[PDB]
Amino acid sequence: MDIRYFGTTPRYSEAVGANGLIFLSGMVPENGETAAEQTADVLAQIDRWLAECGSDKAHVLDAVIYLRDMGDYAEMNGVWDAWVAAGRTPARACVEARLARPEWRVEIKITAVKRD
Amino acid sequence: MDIRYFGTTPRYSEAVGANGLIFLSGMVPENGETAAEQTADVLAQIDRWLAECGSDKAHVLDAVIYLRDMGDYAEMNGVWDAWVAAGRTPARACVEARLARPEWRVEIKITAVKRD
Amino acid sequence: MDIRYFGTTPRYSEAVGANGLIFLSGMVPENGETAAEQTADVLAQIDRWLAECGSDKAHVLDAVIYLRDMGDYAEMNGVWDAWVAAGRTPARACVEARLARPEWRVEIKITAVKRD
């Protein structure tokens, strides 16, 4: 059960891997203003970090999606639905929770697996 | 690290399994109005999905319980306590977060394991 | 995929283990009033349960931190930062959600691995 740390800071690591499993930090918007824009940005970050860890979006197991405002549900979904891999959509939960900054509309927390 | 998908939709799968591990989507109420009724319904869904993936409630590792309103803590607990397998109770966390529909008072997110 | 249960009660287990993975229940404050005091207490409980399970803070994969009030973010961080294992910081998510009692300012949910 060797642990690998990716993108380590004094506070957290962007991803942590162990025995084929990959746990991503909550990805948080770096660009965009609207729910649509920020969801695309968050998912683009997930894409990079998965690639870093030897994974991709078609190997995601689990996604918890935190929305600041549940009124943004359909907009977030439109972007999510277009990003997800057909036939390989992950387990998902979406709940409403305020994030570390007021301007952040969406945060997504991913669990994935490496390719064999 | 082969991935199995169960009850796959264009948006999510109801369950994803990898290397003996099982991740359920957040289960949301399909019947009932009060927290007690909706908790029962959610836990029955969990039973059926765990059965599908070759698991059961005695093999649940982890459960995150989201309540729309923390005022329903005790009422939810009454159904939860009666449901869990004695001596094989999982790790648990319960926090307050609004869900995708305003009528949903509870949502439960399960991690479990395949029987050998 | 044999399951080990630690600190089992009728409602939940403080920790459960399977295939070298460890899932802790949400740890909530037992002592302290301020966000700083409560965080240190929660992290001290996490230290104790990890040790029970053959693990420690340098083998934590994932941490979800729920704050009652996101106004407590920097104060929580101060304690968290001084607690983590340098170079071995885990995946992290922090999100605002009310907890089971109103005096509780912070709850932390840990996923970890056994040492070899």
Side-chain angles (χ1 to χ4, degrees):
Chain A
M1 290 291 264
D2 285 54
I3 311 168
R4 289 186 62 194
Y5 303 87
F6 304 89
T8 298
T9 81
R11 185 168 296 157
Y12 64 91
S13 297
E14 301 286 13
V16 176
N19 194 25
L21 285 161
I22 298 161
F23 297 77
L24 267 49
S25 279
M27 292 300 154
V28 105
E30 282 163 358
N31 293 282
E33 294 178 309
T34 71
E37 282 165 353
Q38 294 191 346
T39 306
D41 182 82
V42 164
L43 291 170
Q45 290 176 62
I46 287 159
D47 279 344
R48 292 185 280 275
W49 287 111
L50 291 175
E52 260 294 313
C53 302
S55 193
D56 50 52
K57 58 184 197 180
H59 288 80
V60 170
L61 299 178
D62 190 48
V64 183
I65 304 167
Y66 304 99
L67 292 170
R68 175 186 177 78
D69 195 328
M70 190 59 66
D72 280 344
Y73 189 61
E75 197 181 333
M76 182 276 297
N77 280 335
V79 179
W80 169 270
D81 291 2
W83 171 84
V84 106
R88 306 179 64 97
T89 59
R92 202 186 89 159
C94 172
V95 301
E96 200 197 67
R98 292 199 187 235
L99 313 168
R101 308 199 150 112
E103 338 92 49
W104 296 350
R105 315 290 302 191
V106 52
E107 179 168 348
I108 303 181
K109 180 191 138 55
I110 291 285
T111 308
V113 297
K114 285 192 93 215
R115 294 177 225 101
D116 280 6
Chain B
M1 292 301 270
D2 301 60
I3 312 166
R4 282 198 67 181
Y5 300 89
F6 301 87
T8 299
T9 90
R11 179 169 295 152
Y12 64 86
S13 303
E14 293 288 5
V16 182
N19 197 29
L21 283 169
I22 302 164
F23 291 82
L24 304 193
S25 273
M27 294 294 157
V28 296
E30 291 175 337
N31 293 292
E33 290 181 330
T34 63
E37 294 163 347
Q38 296 197 338
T39 304
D41 184 77
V42 163
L43 293 173
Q45 288 178 65
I46 286 167
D47 282 329
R48 282 168 264 155
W49 286 108
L50 287 172
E52 253 295 283
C53 312
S55 188
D56 52 61
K57 66 193 183 176
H59 291 74
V60 175
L61 302 176
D62 194 61
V64 182
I65 302 165
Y66 308 97
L67 290 173
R68 151 168 280 248
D69 191 318
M70 193 56 71
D72 293 335
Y73 191 55
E75 192 179 332
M76 182 275 296
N77 284 333
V79 184
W80 172 272
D81 291 4
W83 175 79
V84 284
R88 296 188 65 103
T89 57
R92 200 184 93 154
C94 176
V95 313
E96 195 193 71
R98 302 211 214 215
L99 316 165
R101 285 220 274 267
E103 60 261 32
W104 298 344
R105 307 202 62 83
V106 58
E107 173 168 352
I108 305 186
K109 206 203 157 215
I110 292 281
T111 304
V113 91
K114 265 254 230 172
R115 280 182 315 268
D116 288 337
Chain C
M1 292 313 247
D2 283 351
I3 313 170
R4 294 169 71 183
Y5 300 92
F6 300 82
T8 298
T9 84
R11 186 166 298 169
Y12 66 88
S13 293
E14 301 280 10
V16 334
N19 197 40
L21 278 188
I22 294 155
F23 292 79
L24 304 193
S25 274
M27 298 292 157
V28 292
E30 283 175 337
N31 300 288
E33 300 163 307
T34 68
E37 290 161 348
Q38 292 196 345
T39 303
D41 182 82
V42 164
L43 294 170
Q45 291 176 68
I46 290 166
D47 285 337
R48 287 199 292 103
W49 289 108
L50 291 174
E52 267 274 296
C53 296
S55 194
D56 54 60
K57 57 193 200 173
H59 295 78
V60 173
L61 303 172
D62 191 52
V64 178
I65 305 168
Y66 306 96
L67 294 175
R68 176 179 183 79
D69 188 333
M70 192 58 68
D72 280 335
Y73 187 63
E75 192 180 335
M76 183 278 292
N77 279 336
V79 177
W80 171 271
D81 290 358
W83 177 81
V84 291
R88 305 175 63 101
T89 55
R92 207 185 93 148
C94 182
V95 117
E96 197 194 78
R98 301 181 118 111
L99 313 172
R101 293 210 262 276
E103 329 92 51
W104 296 350
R105 307 209 65 80
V106 63
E107 178 163 359
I108 299 182
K109 178 192 153 47
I110 294 286
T111 305
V113 64
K114 280 188 73 190
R115 294 178 299 260
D116 282 349

